[PDB]
Design a protein around this ligand. Sequence first.
Ligand SMILES: O=C(O)c1ccc(CN2C(=O)C3(CCN(S(=O)(=O)c4cccs4)CC3)c3cc(Br)ccc32)cc1
Lengths: 224, 12
Amino acid sequence: HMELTPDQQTLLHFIMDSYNKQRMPQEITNKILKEAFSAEENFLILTEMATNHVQVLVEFTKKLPGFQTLDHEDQIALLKGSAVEAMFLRSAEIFNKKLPSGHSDLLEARIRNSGISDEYITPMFSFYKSIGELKMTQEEYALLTAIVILSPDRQYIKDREAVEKLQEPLLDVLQKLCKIHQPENPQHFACLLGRLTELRTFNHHHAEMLMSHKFTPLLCEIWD
Amino acid sequence: ENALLRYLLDKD
Ligand SMILES: O=C(O)c1ccc(CN2C(=O)C3(CCN(S(=O)(=O)c4cccs4)CC3)c3cc(Br)ccc32)cc1
């Protein structure tokens, strides 16, 4: 309600440090700018982006306080079950903050002309706008990503209580940060909770999309 | 076998 404890401050610092190490490589941004505007090249660019995110996700997750202490199989189960959710969350941040106006407009043009159906494209861009409206801080993007990743309810987890012990202090820090920075808006934490449930819907859209030149063996064996 | 995840998780 007033301030974070030194322990909550320490926990937040490790999440923030790990979250800020990520950067879009020059090679990827140069492709969005110069490659041909065809379904083939547009899908290829997006596949490259999807693959780069998996590497970014593993490295962020490995540095989360207590992730290394979880059983090896549970570490794999958490990465598999959150990969799609963490991708759409990070993509929302880049679209609304990182990418320059023109470069983001070219990537949106590439996305909308990559052979993917509107049944997938429409909720994706609806979710991007819905995220933009909340005007989330970097602390809020970092905590939300960590909460999504450390979900104790994912399939094939053996020791769920261990993941529960890791996630509960993050929800506590996030709620406290809402009370400190938005004390005039008591429904702010609830709006952020609304994004966790909207993100869950992307597990179906993604698995249904994968069912249909679009064949990418590497990403298919990770996701499902 | 989740060979890629296993490699990336236990790397460097
Ligand atoms: O190089 C990096 O550092 C890096 C980091 C994070 C990302 C994440 N990211 C994405 O994954 C997409 C959204 C999903 N689509 S997709 O079309 O649904 C699809 C095609 C194939 C499988 S799923 C792909 C691009 C995207 C868009 C915008 Br704007 C910002 C970030 C991202 C990428 C790169």
